[PDB]
Amino acid sequence: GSTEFLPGSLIDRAEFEAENRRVVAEGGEPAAGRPVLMGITKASLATDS
C-alpha cells in the first residue's frame, strides 16, 4: 500500500480499515489484505500490552 504496512504482517482489521479510510483520503490508493486466523497463543502474544 502506502502507509507503513510491511507485506506479510498481521494487524487487527479495525485499525487496518481505519488506515485504509485515512489513506483513500489525502491521495487515493489502497492497502489490501486478506483475513487470517491465528492460534490463541499467537493472538495473546501479539497484543498491544
Added chain:
Amino acid sequence: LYRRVINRNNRLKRLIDLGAPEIIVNNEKRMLQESVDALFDNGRRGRP
C-alpha cells in the same frame, strides 16, 4: 555474579594500564564478556 564481573573488570584495567601481550588482554576481555553474559543469562551460552 556481580563480584565475578567486578574482579574481571579490575584485572583487565590493571592489565591494560600495566602493559601486556594482546593475547593475554584478549583472554581477559573474553572472560569479562562471559562474566557479563553470565550475570544477565546464566547458561544461555555454553555451560552455565
Added chain:
Amino acid sequence: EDESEALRQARKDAELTASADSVRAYLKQIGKVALLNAEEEVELAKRIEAGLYATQLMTELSERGEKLPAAQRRDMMWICRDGDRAKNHLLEANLRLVVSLAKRYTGRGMAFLDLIQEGNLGLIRAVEKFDYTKGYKFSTYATWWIR
C-alpha cells in the same frame, strides 16, 4: 598421508574452529608460540635491558637534553621497541608454565581462567624483576612469583 596437500588443509581447517569453551580457546591461542631455552631467554634479557636503558636515557634527555638528531633519536626509539617486543615474546613463551602451575589450585573459590590470569600477572612481575646475570633458569625464579 603427510605430503601432496593431504593433511595440511586438515590442520588449517582444524585451527579455524570456534572452540566455544573459553579455556579451550585460550589453550589453542597459547599453543601458537614455541618454547625457549637458556640461550634465547638470556638474549631476550639482554634486549629488554637495552630497551630499559634507552628509555631511561630518553627520559633524561626530555628535560635537560639536546635537540636530538635523527641518527641519535631513531636508533634509540628502535632499540626501545625491540626491547619491549622481546619482553612480550618471553611472556608469550612462558604462559604455558603459568597455566601448568595454576592448574593445581582449582576446585575452591575462583575459576580456572581467573587462576590463569593471576598467574599471568605474576609472570609479568617475574619478568620485570628477573636478573639474567645470576645464571639461573628462568622457570625456577618465575615459579615463586606465579605462586
Added chain:
Amino acid sequence: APVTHIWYFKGVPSRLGYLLDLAPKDLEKIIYFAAYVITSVDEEMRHNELSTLEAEMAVERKAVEDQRDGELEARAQKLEADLAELEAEGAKADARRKVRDGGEREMRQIRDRAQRELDRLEDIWSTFTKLAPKQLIVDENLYRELVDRYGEYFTGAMGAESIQKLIENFDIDAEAESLRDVIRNGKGQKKLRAL
C-alpha cells in the same frame, strides 16, 4: 572494554545479526575474540594507490620469481654434480637414475612449496583488493600479514568494541530504504530475508 548485551546478541532471531547482516556465528567469532572483522576500509585512498600498490606486489612477486629461478639454477648445478658422480663412473641404470629421482622429488617439493607461497601471496593480494567493511577473516596470520603490509587502507579489530564501531558507522536510513527496494523488486527467499 565494551561488552555486547547477550539478549540482543543471542536469541531465536539474532537482533544484532539482522541489524548488521551477519550470521550469529560471525557475531560470536567477533564477540568472543576468535577472529577479526574489517571495521572500515579507505575506499578512495585504496583506489588512488591501487596502481602503485599493484606495482609493489608485482615487484615482490618478481623477486619471488628471481629466488625460484635461483633455486632452479642451484638444482641445475646439483643435477650436473649428479651427472658427474653417476653417469661418469661405474653404476647401474637404476642406480644412476636413483639420484635423478632424488633430485626429481627435491625439485617437485621445492616447486610445490614455492607454489603454495604463490597461492598465499595471491590470496593476500586478492583479499586486499576485495576487502570490504563488516567482512570477517579467520586465520589471524592473514590479518597479521594484511596489517604489516597495509597498516593503513583499513582499520580492523576484534570484539564488542569493533561491533560498537560497526554500529556507529551505520547508515540506518539508507539500509532501510535498500531493504524496502529489495522488498518491492526481488521475490522469494530474498523477499523473506528482507522482510
